[PDB]
């Protein structure tokens, strides 16, 4: 019994019910089995966890829970009360019981309590009743678990949910010590690896945490999360997680990009990873690179399907619209918007060539630069081309989710191509807005120009 | 007969029908009068300008146009055939006609042909039949104007639609020459100012362009457009156009932020500015306009679209609601294309006179820093407060439109405070991703 699927766990605009239903169809299609409801800014999940669902809301939520059952996806309802629950006070404990009970009555059999991204410091009243913050959480968590009839699936997300968040370290943490000791064994605990966005999740590090928490965790994976940087998007493949974790884990629920349709590779390649060693115990079963090609290939079919005879002569202007998206276009796009700690090859290459051309620009040995520049201008040409043919695609829902990303990168690669062309011879200037002005002081018939568009 | 309202002419996710209908409500409330439908990436407005609306599509357009009549908004339908049209071919010219006909059958009196953001180079067969790009645009704009029986309102957007785009100069341009000449006089012309995004539109520039087009232009104003920078939003006020423009102009159609709910101030202050001097041949103040607009907007925050703690117990996270100081700071952080708001620049200026003077913590010029610093750590806490209060607001529709901008600025000020707290003692290294890494290597 391995929970593998998607947690809608992120900050910002939640996915709508139509998307969540489509999400279940995709998980089924790819042999995943689990959905964790936890949109940080779906107001009744956290901010207003207390408030019960309206009549309209309840219909929508029942239908969804129903849709989950229909597609064989475990539906896990989470609630996030740590911002302002008074744990000691039993009327609050009663509200939590009421909220969850309404949902169970919507058909939900699986639940979670999430205590991530909250202050550690308690209120007077709670300290008089609880030794530690961890004590309080484990108290209601166990109370709720028991009150809901000890369900096959109940999840707990610690406030110390990655390596860096443990004081003073993972293995000697008072918080986790208490959770591992006091939290009923039937409950599962979520973990996001060594950091919030773990590059790698080494088996050594799961071994460690499993000991302090006295059970195998469910990964809450933020490899493909993009809520924390307006400019970023992650289309690279699942990576940095050995198939040798599978037997040493209870599950992996990925918390992907906000833009629903950008998560084809993200969920696809997680399914490939899971399925590659589904029944392992304890020869390379999982290749990120292969899994990526495998998913981009599948994804590509979606671009020619809608939302969800005039040829011009040899002397007439050709259809802008003619050429459709290619695998090569998506292979490039994915390399440009790859993973949080790594660009795809085609993307790194470009940066490495530009870095070089900019260094050796002085030369004005010179048939090298003319030649390298050329090859770079050509690459820049494929980015624009890629943007151009995406812009034309029939699946306008996919385009709309990605538009602002691809517009950005094509527009920047354009200024860069300009800048190389000029080495061999508007508000693109306040760029980044104020956020960027602050950020740049922290430590780390002529063809036109100032064509903004 | 002054066209003032809004054009949906930006790149990316078009607005949906519900939002368009609510726009007409707001335009009518604020006594503006026009809507120009020109979403760059609505497939059938441009990329696929030749394709007829489906039946489902048509009913939605009919219902929308009807909604405009009922809110007393003039609905202008634009189409954009620049990228692929063989202007010389009359099968092509027919295709355009059959398509503008379908739209008039939905109840549309008013039209536009847009030739913005295309390459100024015609195909072989087109170059035989026309002498210059302008001639060809004008020929079909003229033929279409007429066919439709000289609609009261019919617009033309020139390829050369701002100062800087005109080869070689505004007043000396062969393209504008042909336009002001051969384009029939009933047809109105769109113009964005000196630049694409224009910081100012001087009278002299309008008088100048007026002369070469031989008519008073309609401004397509891109002041609050935000489709050209992922991280930018413009909540600042209409500015850099004098009330003295108005009688020199047939209209102003603002083309505002992609995010629908962010365009409250951007449209409301335009409204104020038109009211200021509806007829004529000082009166309009940016800052006062903004305050009226922000003070109206805040009402929308508290309305959609319990338990009380003992002082022993944990206070409601949700209690304090969004204030007009919050919106005032927010707008200053996300002001205008060429200028940050007062409270925005203040915070930047301080952080730059906190970084320079930082090795002064390594006795009269220490008491300065440590104070100026904590007066800035506090100003940072004003940003992170406005976020948490916004993120608690009842109107989630507005929150979601703003969310990621708001999350960004608070994230950065959180880190910039961390820095100031440290200069006085995880993924942020690939900040901005690849595009980011390239932007840092440019000048």
Numbering used by the authors:
A (entry chain B): 59 to 340, 371 to 396, 537 to 592, 603 to 663, 677 to 695, 707 to 715
B (entry chain A): 59 to 339, 372 to 395, 537 to 593, 601 to 663, 677 to 694
Please give sentences taken from the publication describing this entry.
Human O-linked β-N-acetylglucosaminidase (hOGA) is one of the two enzymes involved in nuclear and cytoplasmic protein O-GlcNAcylation, an essential post-translational modification. The enzyme catalyzes the hydrolysis of the GlcNAc-O-(Ser/Thr) glycosidic bonds via anchimeric assistance through the 2-acetamido group of the GlcNAc sugar. OGA is a multidomain enzyme comprising a nonfunctional acetyltransferase domain, a glycoside hydrolase domain that belongs to CAZy family 84 (GH84), and a structurally important stalk domain involved in dimerization. GH84 enzymes operate via anchimeric assistance by the 2-acetamido group of the GlcNAc sugar of the substrate.15−20 The reaction mechanism involves two distinct chemical steps (named “cyclization” and “ring opening”, respectively), leading to hydrolysis with retention of configuration at the anomeric center.
Here we report a crystal structure of wild type hOGA in complex with a nonhydrolyzable glycopeptide substrate in which the peptide is S-GlcNAcylated at a cysteine residue. Crystals of WT hOGA, protein produced by coexpression of the glycoside hydrolase domain (residues 11–396) and the stalk domain (535–715),11 were seeded with a known peptide substrate derived from casein kinase II (CKII) (339-YPGGSTPVSSANMM-352) and the corresponding CKII-Cys-GlcNAc glycopeptide. This peptide was produced by S-GlcNAcylation using OGT. The resulting hOGA-CKII-Cys-GlcNAc structure shows density at the active site, corresponding to GlcNAc-Cys. GlcNAc was bound in a 1,4B/1S3 conformation, with several interactions between the GlcNAc moiety and hOGA residues, from N2, O7, O3, O4, and O6 of GlcNAc, to D174, N280, K98, G67, N313, and D285 that have been previously characterized.11 The peptide could be partially built into the active site of one monomer. In summary, the results of both X-ray crystallography and QM/MM simulations reported are consistent with hOGA using a preactivated 1,4B/1S3 conformation for catalysis.
